[PDB]
Write a protein that binds this ligand. Sequence first.
Ligand SMILES: OC[C@H]1O[C@@H](O[C@@H]2[C@@H](O)[C@H](O)O[C@H](CO)[C@H]2O)[C@H](O)[C@@H](O)[C@@H]1O
Ligand SMILES: OC[C@H]1O[C@@H](O[C@@H]2[C@@H](O)[C@H](O)O[C@H](CO)[C@H]2O)[C@H](O)[C@@H](O)[C@@H]1O
Length: 752
Amino acid sequence: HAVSVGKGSYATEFPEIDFGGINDPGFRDQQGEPPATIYRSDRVTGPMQTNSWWGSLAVDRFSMNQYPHPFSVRHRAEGLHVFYDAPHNMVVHENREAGTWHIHGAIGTDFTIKHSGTANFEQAVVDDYNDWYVRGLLENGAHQMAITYGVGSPYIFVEYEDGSAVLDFDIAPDVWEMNGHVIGFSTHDHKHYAAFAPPGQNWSGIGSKTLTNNADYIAIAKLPEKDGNMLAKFEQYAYSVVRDAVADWTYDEATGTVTTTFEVTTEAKVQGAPDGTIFALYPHQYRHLASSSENQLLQNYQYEIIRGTMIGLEGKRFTTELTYPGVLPSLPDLGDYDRERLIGYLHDATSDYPTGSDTYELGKYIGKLATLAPIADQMGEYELAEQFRGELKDILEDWLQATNASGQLKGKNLFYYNENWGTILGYHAAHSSATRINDHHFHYGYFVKAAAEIARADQEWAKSENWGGMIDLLIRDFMADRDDDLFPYLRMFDPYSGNSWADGLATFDAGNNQQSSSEAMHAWTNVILWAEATGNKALRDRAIYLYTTEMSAINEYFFDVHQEIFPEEYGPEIVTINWGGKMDHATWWNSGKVEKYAINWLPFHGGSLYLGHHPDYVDRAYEELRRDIGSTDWNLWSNLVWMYRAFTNPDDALQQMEASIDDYGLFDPGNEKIIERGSTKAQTYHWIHNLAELGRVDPTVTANHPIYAVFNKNGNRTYIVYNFSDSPITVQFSDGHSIQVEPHSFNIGNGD
Ligand SMILES: OC[C@H]1O[C@@H](O[C@@H]2[C@@H](O)[C@H](O)O[C@H](CO)[C@H]2O)[C@H](O)[C@@H](O)[C@@H]1O
Ligand SMILES: OC[C@H]1O[C@@H](O[C@@H]2[C@@H](O)[C@H](O)O[C@H](CO)[C@H]2O)[C@H](O)[C@@H](O)[C@@H]1O
């Protein structure tokens, strides 16, 4: 009932859960499994994809509302409803007492794509998928309608079995261009679309509420404008149905460049149809478009969506280019702190304990210990650092074993492989990590942090035959490569939307969502560190690709650093939860003002420096939070605000820290006013004093190795490298600076 993996194991039978005498129904219901029923055809076998923009198609009989931008769509017994949020559908609402804001559209229907033979389909199943498109199959015996659609596709491709095409409207549309087999039309409220059938198959019902075509293939396009030249361009690719779509990437270690090429492969539905499509690019893509793709832009082809303006680009492929900025295992010892005061805070942290038994609360605790251990090493407190790492080893050697001393499955503190979906689940579970396959990057990222800190000091422990095998299993669950026997590809990540999606099932009418983008960035950071420590180049590079891409989406959709995406009337300077179809300044729990910003900053670690790349943003966001609070009396998590403020004004951060850090004493789970429960006084004091000495993050300098950071204080650069190798290295920076680094050390600020 368990599979050995090095010294560890995972359960292959669902354990008899030890509830610990807790009767709370919510807690008990968490210790379960994801849904038994998966709505997929027999063409889709093996580990099932989860955490996707389209997931509600797999989980609900039909689907919930989905956002294949620029459209929204939903499957129903009667067919596929299609919608586009026009400006008149978009609203920005504020609930002052709740402190929440919501940017959202409507769940309406512009028309329904129907099958002539039935309006009572039995179910809609996933019939195929690739990196960002899905093929949904509405089924009723011989009657079938296969719908191919995707984020960044202004087409919906429709294939019929045993019937023909129907477009049904509640109010008769305006057919403003009638080319026989191709029509340009607008809804009563002036939304512009087109429909395409093979030559000779002419549309009927023009002027009525129901447009019909005898063809067994049609495509729908959202048109950017009521424009016959655009209609003519959409005709060129309307018969090229996307079958394959891959996002292939490379990391150039010398330059830091992460290059991603998005390539489709299509199947021709008429003779001579080109192999290509029209893509709709999101801001995080087109702002980084490779020179070589520029000639494919369709300049005036714009769509407004929740994430700003999408633009059209034609052809088989396009490429984006991003810059990986490095990460560190920890800030080094470069601050002007009182070392005895910091040593005292390190000892104070021995009082801390996890505030729950589930993967998330245990995760926060081990992240806390892993953050303290290098600081203890720096202060010369090696015995204390060893105590922290020993505690990490004790916790991980427990959780990474599924059996007890007698060889029976444990009832808690273990991992289990759900074969139905194909996912590793940890018990105790929380935040629907097991029942909805939620948040695996957020939770398991902390387990990887703990393992990476152990590996930094003890390479033996981290070997695959020891505890490394189980760590690499957890990593595969949340970010597997292609053709993994146990897990779907890159579970958490949507390579086209550019971000992770936290909900395994996506059964919301706003599509999927992600709240803590920083806990996603923390997961990617820790995989980079773990992979560097254990000599796994392929895994490291995949995590670099994720870190760097996710960063591009965070800066657009969570922060809107360019002040182009959020509506002018939206008050806050952050979106807390991004959805497929809407944006909230709100949290998944009842919180105050600080938390609706800081949930996208925490935890602070050696990969957090991406938060400081846009100093005008950091100032604008801080000042807005300060305005709303009305002072620097933060309602909760004060230390996170001080650490954030230190990115641009460490003098201010320092004065706030000095005034309040010692307000309360040792760890108290009931009181997060000053110190957030995943944080410590030691971490806070070490971070702010390091920033005070280093100055600003400098993202204009790259290096030819991946574990580094560059800071700039009034034109004076500080270069930091950590070397995980047994051998000395030389690191070349993009500004001409060159340094040597000894084995298993920082170049500067090793401490002692
Ligand atoms: O959707 C991902 C997020 O899910 C959150 O839990 C949700 C519950 O709070 C709510 O009552 O029910 C929905 C399902 O309808 C749950 O998804 C977690 O708390 C978040 O951590 C998670 O990212
Ligand atoms: O401060 C006590 C409150 O903490 C909340 O936990 C938050 C998580 O839900 C969220 O996923 O992460 C943040 C940051 O780690 C946590 O503070 C509980 O949900 C509340 O019920 C609790 O009162």
